[PDB]
Design a protein around this ligand. Structure first.
Ligand SMILES: Cc1cc2nc3c(=O)[nH]c(=O)nc-3n(C[C@H](O)[C@H](O)[C@H](O)COP(=O)(O)O)c2cc1C
Ligand SMILES: Cc1cc2nc3c(=O)[nH]c(=O)nc-3n(C[C@H](O)[C@H](O)[C@H](O)COP(=O)(O)O)c2cc1C
Ligand SMILES: NC(=O)c1cc(N2CC2)c([N+](=O)[O-])cc1[N+](=O)[O-]
Ligand SMILES: NC(=O)c1cc(N2CC2)c([N+](=O)[O-])cc1[N+](=O)[O-]
Lengths: 217, 216
């Protein structure tokens, strides 16, 4: 069925059925979804942690403490749990890595075309790095775009999920040693299948009317 | 299959100005923008959809400086959507959201409505008072909407291209969204690519998972 039907019917799951795992093929597909999301200048300023074992999810679940105990069950009961992370700083060695990958994938007919791409990426990278001083926020924006792509995609695969901002990033970061690796956790997304306990599965979806949020010209 | 569309979609560099969206597709595009999820269902956004040649030209003005090469995408495309984020989360917006959820029957009792409003106010207060990042927090929700939109339109058989290469100050002044309490973030022309689009035949490139993904 069309994505409009998927968009109108998907929902944030409030409780997962821990016995319903992703199929082996589905496990590979969600990884493909994560990698192929678009990003400004194809910068891909991200890293993903995909927890599928009881041990792995327990380590992620440490972040659902304090005022976030509300999300612990979700992190432990879902089949797979994805931690979306953003680079803490945009370094030149990474920018080079991106251009070389496009080059190796055959996107530049001449060594001038490749040089033109590195320059174009350098323009935006420096605009945020040197002038605006918001490269951390710029990269986080790309990660959130990835989350959006990911949420609709998994729903399209007939999978349930829930985006989570309610977790302790410092706790999660320390658990997986992300700071020293050059990353920071932003959004946690448990994916699997909802249980009968998921009260949100049967409730009507609510959104502000278009006359308030949309202008046609 | 959604994996097929994720692997086949691409950023179109040039649109065929002859291919316009059908009235059904034009409606579906707005449905996608409206139904995207957001933290606490805060929906801190505004969208400007330009379908007329005059409307599109107004948007295209934000690319007259160092972004001249982006004007053609904005004019040749059937529909052009500029994603805007609120500049500040106000109690008036917070009430509109919870009252709308109430109208839509998401609350069984007035206590749940009160609890939902309190839970959202909690997250909203934290960002403006403590973290001092409410503007970026709302902007991130808008980017999440963009991610959802790009996949959605690709699945509809439509071509699109997210554009960051535009002057937000110019675009803001054009549509007066400044006084309205919004800021332009992303421009997304939607339509059908022309035979001229070089990116259409180009292989997609992404870093391998051994670099970006850790399994535990
Ligand atoms: C960035 C982000 C963070 C979220 N964090 C949480 C969370 O911590 N807990 C939760 O139960 N839902 C969370 N949600 C889900 C939203 O509340 C939900 O998307 C919204 O109410 C609309 O409902 P729907 O997703 O079912 O359409 C989050 C959503 C987004 C976009
Ligand atoms: C936030 C954002 C801004 C972008 N801005 C531009 C732009 O100004 N010009 C352009 O040609 N492409 C732009 N793109 C498209 C990206 O360069 C493109 O998604 C990326 O190189 C990956 O290629 P793909 O979209 O074909 O998968 C933008 C993409 C994103 C996510
Ligand atoms: N990687 C790109 O697609 C790209 C290339 C250029 N250069 C070729 C024209 C520019 N830009 O210069 O603004 C901007 C982007 N961008 O996505 O932000
Ligand atoms: N009570 C809820 O079900 C709830 C709680 C949270 N926060 C506390 C974790 C968020 N949210 O943050 O978006 C959203 C919802 N929601 O209504 O979908």
């Amino acid at each position: 069925m069309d994505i409009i039907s998927v968009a109108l019917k998907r929902h944030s799951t409030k409780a997962f059925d821990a016995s319903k795992k992703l199929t082996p093929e589905q496990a590979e597909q969600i990884k493909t979804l994560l990698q192929y999301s678009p990003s400004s200048t194809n910068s891909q300023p991200w890293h993903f942690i995909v927890a599928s074992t009881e041990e792995g999810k327990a380590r992620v679940a440490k972040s659902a403490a304090g005022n976030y105990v509300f999300n612990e069950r979700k992190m432990l009961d879902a089949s797979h749990v994805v931690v979306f992370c953003a680079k803490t700083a945009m370094d030149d060695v990474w920018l080079k890595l991106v251009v070389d990958q496009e080059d190796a994938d055959g996107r530049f007919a001449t060594p001038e075309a490749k040089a033109a791409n590195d320059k174009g990426r350098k323009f935006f990278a420096d605009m945020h790095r040197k002038d605006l001083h918001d490269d951390a926020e710029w990269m986080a924006k790309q990660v959130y775009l990835n989350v959006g792509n990911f949420l609709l995609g998994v729903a399209a695969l007939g999978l349930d999920a829930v985006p989570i901002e309610g977790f302790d990033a410092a706790i999660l970061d320390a658990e997986f040693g992300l700071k020293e690796k050059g990353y920071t956790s932003l959004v946690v997304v448990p994916v699997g299948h909802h249980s009968v306990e998921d009260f949100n599965a049967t409730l009507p979806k609510s959104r502000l009317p278009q006359n308030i949020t949309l202008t046609e010209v």
